[PDB]
Every structure is written in structure tokens, then in C-alpha cells.
Amino acid sequence: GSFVEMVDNLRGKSGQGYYVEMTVGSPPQTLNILVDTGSSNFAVGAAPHPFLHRYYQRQLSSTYRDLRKGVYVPYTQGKWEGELGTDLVSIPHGPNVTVRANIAAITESDKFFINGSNWEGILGLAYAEIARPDDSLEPFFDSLVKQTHVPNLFSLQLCGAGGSMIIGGIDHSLYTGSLWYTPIRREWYYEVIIVRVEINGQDLKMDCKEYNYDKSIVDSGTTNLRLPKKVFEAAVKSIKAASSTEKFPDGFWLGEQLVCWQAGTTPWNIFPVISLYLMGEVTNQSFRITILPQQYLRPVEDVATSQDDCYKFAISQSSTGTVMGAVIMEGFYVVFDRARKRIGFAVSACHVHDEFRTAAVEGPFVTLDMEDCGY
Numbered sequence: 611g612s613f614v615e616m617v618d619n620l621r622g623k624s625g626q627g628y629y630v631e632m633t634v635g636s637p638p639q640t641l642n643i644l645v646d647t648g649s650s651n652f653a654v655g656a657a658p659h660p661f662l663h664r665y666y667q668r669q670l671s672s673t674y675r676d677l678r679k680g681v682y683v684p685y686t687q688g689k690w691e692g693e694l695g696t697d698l699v700s701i702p703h704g705p706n707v708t709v710r711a712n713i714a715a716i717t718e719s720d721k722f723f724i725n726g727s728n729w730e731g732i733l734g735l736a737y738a739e740i741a742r743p744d745d746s747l748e749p750f751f752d753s754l755v756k757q758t759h760v761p762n763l764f765s766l767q768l769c770g771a772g773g774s775m776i777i778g779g780i781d782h783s784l785y786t787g788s789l790w791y792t793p794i795r796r797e798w799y800y801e802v803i804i805v806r807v808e809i810n811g812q813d814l815k816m817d818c819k820e821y822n823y824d825k826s827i828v829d830s831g832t833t834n835l836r837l838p839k840k841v842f843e844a845a846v847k848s849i850k851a852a853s854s855t856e857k858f859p860d861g862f863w864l865g866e867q868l869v870c871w872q873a874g875t876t877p878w879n880i881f882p883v884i885s886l887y888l889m890g891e892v893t894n895q896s897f898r899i900t901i902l903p904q905q906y907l908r909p910v911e912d913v914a915t916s917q918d919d920c921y922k923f924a925i926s927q928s929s930t931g932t933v934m935g936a937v938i939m940e941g942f943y944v945v946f947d948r949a950r951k952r953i954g955f956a957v958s959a960c961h962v963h964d965e966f967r968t969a970a971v972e973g974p975f976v977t978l979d980m981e982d983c984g985y
């Protein structure tokens with residue numbers, strides 16, 4: 611179960627999710643599971659559904675234990691409902707271990723499962739504070755650390771059109787340059803602090819608390835870079851100005867319409883780079899991660915539109931704070947250092963670049979005239 615054996619253990623894409631193979635029950639039942647740093651339940655399809663190729667069959671598992679407790683989870687975009695239980699879980703291309711973990715067996719759901727996503731469940735990697743029905747339900751990663759010798763750290767190398775999830779350590783072959791750390795503000799979501807935002811080197815000039823209204827998180831279970839209204843509007847106005855040689859419909863900027871160019875002609879150069887400055891481990895020091903248009907213009911693979919390269923604008927408005935989703939994580943090696951309450955970023959081996967620009971992790975930056983950016 612070495613790190614080299616864990617490399618390339620993920621499949622999928624930013625739009626439908628990145629997933630890892632796992633087994634549940636005895637004899638083991640293989641399932642594809644979405645790697646989700648934005649939730650804390652290990653929730654798996656346990657009943658037939660039109661979008662599921664397979665599902666967890668508890669009756670076939672001699673090791674299943676029923677907790678006699680239901681779980682009901684409505685959220686803005688949909689819902690899932692299920693039964694809580696425990697069973698044996700393993701990650702075949704992960705650590706060489708088997709643990710007993712809580713499993714929420716999904717019996718009913720609405721707009722939860724995605725057609726052609728190729729996953730049957732979700733591995734919620736965030737903390738117990740946000741687990742459903744409450745924080746008494748121990749998340750999977752917590753059970754793994756308690757029951758094995760596994761160091762309290764995992765890292766994600768998401769690669770654009772799979773990637774790697776290394777549990778227990780840092781795989782140096784997955785990144786170049788320096789690894790810059792941002793503190794985990796609170797252990798609920800992987801909450802962080804953005805101190806500055808620039809669009810093509812031009813500062814958005816907002817009070818830094820605006821960037822974190824009401825929180826900022828690192829979420830591998832969200833596709834887009836999601837920004838609070840005020841920040842979102844300034845970003846769009848700034849991107850529109852930088853790209854003014856071409857005019858796109860309002861629907862493109864709203865993320866409801868594709869923009870298409872003849873195959874291979876995408877004018878990358880007309881789109882600016884976005885720099886997100888994250889709080890450093892030292893007072894008023896920060897580092898920046900730079901996002902190229904290859905990251906924020908998400909390609910939409912469709913045989914029917916294939917004479918063209920078509921894209922969705924992968925930056926959208928949020929009313930629940932900033933979400934640094936998969937389009938942000940792609941091309942970075944992201945270390946979820948739970949042991950040291952910090953998140954590391956470095957340029958990935960699968961990073962984005964063209965012949966003019968490259969995604970980067972750079973620092974340090976100093977800001978003497980700073981307030982706390984935390985909301």
C-alpha cells in the first residue's frame with residue numbers, strides 16, 4: 611500500500627466529480643466513490659436508481675451492523691435519505707488496511723446521483739462538525755486514523771481532461787517547487803482565508819473580509835470557483851474588460867450557456883489570470899495561487915458539438931461564501947494536513963500552462979496594513 615501504488619487512483623472530471631474505488635461489506639462489494647472534502651458523511655447508494663450501475667446490498671454483507679437510526683438530508687440543490695449502519699471498508703488502491711466505518715445507506719434521493727458520473731456514493735472527508743444527522747457520527751477519515759497507524763493527512767492531485775489521493779503522506783513526485791501552507795481556520799469544512807484577489811495583476815481593492823463572507827472553503831465536491839455576490843460581480847466585470855475583443859451572452863457569464871470556438875482555436879490569451887492570495891502561517895504574510903483560463907473555462911465534452919471546443923464559465927455566484935472547487939484544485943497538489951491544521955498548495959505534475967503562462971504557487975507576500983480577513 612505504498613504511495614507509488616496510490617498514484618493514479620482517481621478517475622473522473624471537474625464537472626461530474628473525481629472518484630476512488632472502495633469496497634464495503636464482506637465479501638467486499640466494489641463501488642466507485644466521489645472524493646468530497648466539502649461533506650463529512652460516507653453515504654452510498656443502497657437501493658436501485660436509474661443513474662446507478664450498482665449499489666450497496668447490505669443483506670449480502672455478513673459484517674453489516676444496523677444502527678437503527680435514519681438520516682434525512684435536504685439541501686439547496688436536492689436531497690438524500692437513508693439508514694445508518696457500520697461495515698468493513700477498504701480502499702484497494704489506497705492504504706493497505708480495512709477499517710470499520712459508519713455508512714449511510716441511501717434508500718431515496720432527489721438530484722443527488724449524476725447520470726454518467728460513474729460513482730455510486732460519496733466519501734465525505736471534512737470534519738464531524740458538519741456530519742449528518744449530527745457531530746456524533748464519526749466520519750470515515752477519523753475512523754481510519756483511530757483504527758490504523760495512518761498519519762492524519764491526505765493529499766489530492768486532481769488532473770484535468772484523472773488524479774491521485776495519497777492518504778497518510780506527501781508524494782513529492784506529484785509536485786514541483788515549494789509547498790505553501792494556509793491555516794485551517796475552523797475544523798468543520800476545510801475553512802481557509804483569502805486575503806487578496808487580483809485579476810491580471812489588478813487588485814479587486816475590497817475589504818478582505820468580503821472574500822470570506824461568510825466562510826471560504828476547499829471543496830473537491832464542488833466543480834466551480836464560487837464567490838460571494840460582491841466579489842463575483844467585480845470578478846466578472848474585470849474578466850469582461852480583459853476579454854473585451856469578444857463579447858459573450860449574459861447566459862455565458864451566468865454559467866447557463868456554452869461558449870464555442872472552432873476546434874483548437876480557443877483564444878486563451880484574451881482571458882486574464884486570477885490570483886487568489888491565501889493567509890500564510892505567519893502574521894500578515896500570504897502566498898498566491900494563480901488560476902489560468904484553462905482552469906476557469908471548463909470544457910464540455912459532447913460528440914455533437916465536437917467540430918468545436920465548447921466551454922462553461924466555471925466561476926459562479928454564491929450566497930454561502932467562497933468555494934474553491936475542483937477547477938481551482940486542478941493543476942495543484944493539495945495537502946489536507948489535518949495533523950497540523952493546515953492546507954498546503956504546490957504546482958502539480960499535471961498543472962496547467964501554455965507557452966506564455968503557467969499556474970503557480972508563489973510567495974511570500976507582505977501586507978502591513980492588514981485587519982483580520984476572517985468573517
Ligand SMILES: CC#Cc1cncc(-c2cccc([C@@]3(c4cc(C)c(=O)n(CC)c4)N=C(N)c4c(F)cccc43)c2)c1
Nearest residue numbers: 624625626627628648649653685722732830831832833936
Ligand atoms: C468536483 C465535483 C463534483 C460534483 C459533481 N456533481 C455532483 C456532486 C455532488 C453530488 C451530491 C452531493 C454533493 C455534496 C453533498 C454531499 C453529501 C454527502 C451531503 O450530505 N450533502 C449535503 C450536506 C452535500 N458535496 C458537496 N461538496 C456539495 C456542495 F458543495 C453543494 C451541494 C451538494 C454537495 C455533491 C459533486
